[PDB]
Amino acid sequence: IAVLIDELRNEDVQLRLNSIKKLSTIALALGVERTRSELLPFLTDTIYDEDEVLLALAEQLGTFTTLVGGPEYVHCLLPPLESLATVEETVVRDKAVESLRAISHEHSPSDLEAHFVPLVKRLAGGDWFTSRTSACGLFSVCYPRVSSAVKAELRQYFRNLCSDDTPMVRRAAASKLGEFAKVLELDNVKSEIIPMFSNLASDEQDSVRLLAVEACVNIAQLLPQEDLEALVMPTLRQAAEDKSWRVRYMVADKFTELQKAVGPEITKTDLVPAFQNLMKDCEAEVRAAASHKVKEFCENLSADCRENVIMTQILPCIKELVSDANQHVKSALASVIMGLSPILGKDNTIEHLLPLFLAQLKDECPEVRLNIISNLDCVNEVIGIRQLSQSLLPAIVELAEDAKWRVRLAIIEYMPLLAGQLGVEFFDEKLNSLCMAWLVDHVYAIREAATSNLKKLVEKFGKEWAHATIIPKVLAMSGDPNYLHRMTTLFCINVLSEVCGQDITTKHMLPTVLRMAGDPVANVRFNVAKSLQKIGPILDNSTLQSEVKPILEKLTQDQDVDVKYFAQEALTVLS
Amino acid sequence: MDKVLNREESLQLMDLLGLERSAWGNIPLMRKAYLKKCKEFHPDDEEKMKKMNTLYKKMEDGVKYAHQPDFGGFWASSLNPGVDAIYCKQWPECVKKMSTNCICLLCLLRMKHENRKLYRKDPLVWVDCYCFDCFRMWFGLDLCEGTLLLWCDIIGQTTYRDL
Ligand SMILES: [Zn+2]
Ligand SMILES: [Zn+2]
């Protein structure tokens, strides 16, 4: 009610949207009678403003059927939509188109013939390529239910769009072909779609050609497994070795979608060789695109000649994409290669796959190893344990020393997950100096997470090991001539005492803390006081009275206020 | 440009120039590829020699309409940019979600477009407009530092049109 018809003319400000496109409430109060012969006409030729108002309007009108009267008057909605379906702005048209399809199911079959179809034809025939690219998306939805003769006319108007003066509309049409062929009858896919397909399949512009591939997937699935060779296959086979990488990039990328869509056997004959070439493409981002689909491509090879083709055909190629000159190609493989284990068995994974699995692991490229470290999912269950250690030493050592702070973060971050899969045995001498050269790390969040490392390792390794290996070296920091490192000793203690029991905190840890309370640098000293308070609730009734209390007391008499304060409060937090 | 010839002609004229069929819309290529076929005529098979003509003359005029300004000029202009003309002025910026306190041909033409599209209910296309967006639209081209070089290789050869 209130603010309404007056608010629809403002100054085209996004303050007049909050309530404008709330038209679901306006037309509910305007009544069905008025809404139709008043609101709709208004909304047809009064407002055409910004790409944000119109895009809200296009959306709205696709929800106006039960509000303009019902399915009987849906046709009244067409004009304000057929209008919007013409705005230069792509995102408005697409919504108009999206909303025209929704309401096109609300028409009776008769109303489609009377109204919808004429609309389509005025768009399709228009001078504005904008009008025309909107038409392409509307054939599929009014086709199945219109008359036998109307269908016939609709295929012309499409055929026409397929051969447009403007590349924008051929692209449009290409991209809508597979959708449209799906509601056609076979008689016409074979006769009328295929030629149209054939002609975008091979087109000056590769922007058009590039889009033939997904129609190729779409048309294949329609055609019986015995026509593909005559109709789909020469195009597909040509698209694969196409002049332009943009096109070949498509086939590689939609390859596994192309394999099932084409059938078990045709895969064996045409696809497997055509897939070897993509893996050997001169353009790199094609080789990668095919590397990403290698592992799927093998899981869908018929359940018998798997062992065969994977061994005889795929594997030789894989052996090269490992030795590839490009980081994106290798890193693609490193993140799939080892899913070949379930299908090759166990004898062959040791025979051929491990030479491969351990080649990537020797790679100097950081991103490569990470992925190979990250995938111990289906290779953890099949292959050995001590095997990994051969090149997992340099692997885990170089990664932790990578010039990129945020790679180092990763293995640090990984370390707690490498306990439930490598245990007390693997973690040894030449690896803990690693887990602690991180505490002296210049970057900050690495020191943060490398301390988080010891608390996560403790919570996974009881309180036994700590006293033996770690703590001896954590305290071997309280001696560093650089005060920032002495400090690390305390922060490093402050988190272990959490999960260490009363024992080890009082015995090997405490005598160190008190001993640092004499640091010539003030910063350390107040961190002593702060550190005693985190380790408060853990100690004994008489340990706190004997050795902890008499230290804070001498700390209070400090020529550096900071020390007395954090130490004043320590005394108050623990009596 | 879509309005210059139709598909049937479009391809024919491109064949009679021995020009990669993909290059319709590139006026300066087409021009010079025709000034190169004419060097193979006179006392020079010959039925093509006057066909390339009939086609090419029809396109020269269609293109002359494409270059007519809106409203007949009622309601920076010499010849070919040349010298140190400034086609872009920062790579991503002038092109992407622009930062616009400049007048580089890219930013000028872009202003020209969003100024004309105010009174044109019509959608604009290549050789009506000449802005990057219209170009990148016509050929099938991806927003990249290659595509800019291609565009401003045709602009460097077009005579100050729409300024
Ligand atoms: Zn600029
Ligand atoms: Zn433009």
Author numbering:
A (entry chain A): 13 to 587
B (entry chain E): 1 to 44, 48 to 78, 85 to 172
The authors write:
Crystal structure of the complex was determined by a combination of molecular replacement, using the PP2A A subunit structure as the searching model, and single-wavelength anomalous dispersion of intrinsic zinc atoms in ST, and was refined at 3.1 Å resolution. The four A-ST complexes in the asymmetric unit have essentially the same structure, except HEAT repeats 11–15 that show substantial conformational variation (see below). The position of the indole ring of Trp140 is flipped between these two complex structures, mostly due to the intercalation of Pro132 of ST between Trp140 and Phe141 by forming a hydrophobic core. The linker between helices 2 and 3, which has been implicated in Hsp70 interaction, as well as the linker between J and unique domains (residues 72–86), is not visible in any of the four complexes in the asymmetric unit, suggesting structural flexibility of these two linkers in the A-ST complex.
Specifically, SV40 small t antigen (ST) binds to and perturbs the function of the abundant protein phosphatase 2A (PP2A). PP2A is a family of heterotrimeric enzymes, composed of a structural A subunit, a catalytic C subunit, and one of several regulatory B subunits. SV40 ST consists of an N-terminal J domain and a C-terminal unique domain that contains two separate zinc-binding motifs. SV40 ST binds to the same region of PP2A as the regulatory subunit B56, which provides a structural explanation for the displacement of regulatory B subunits by SV40 ST.
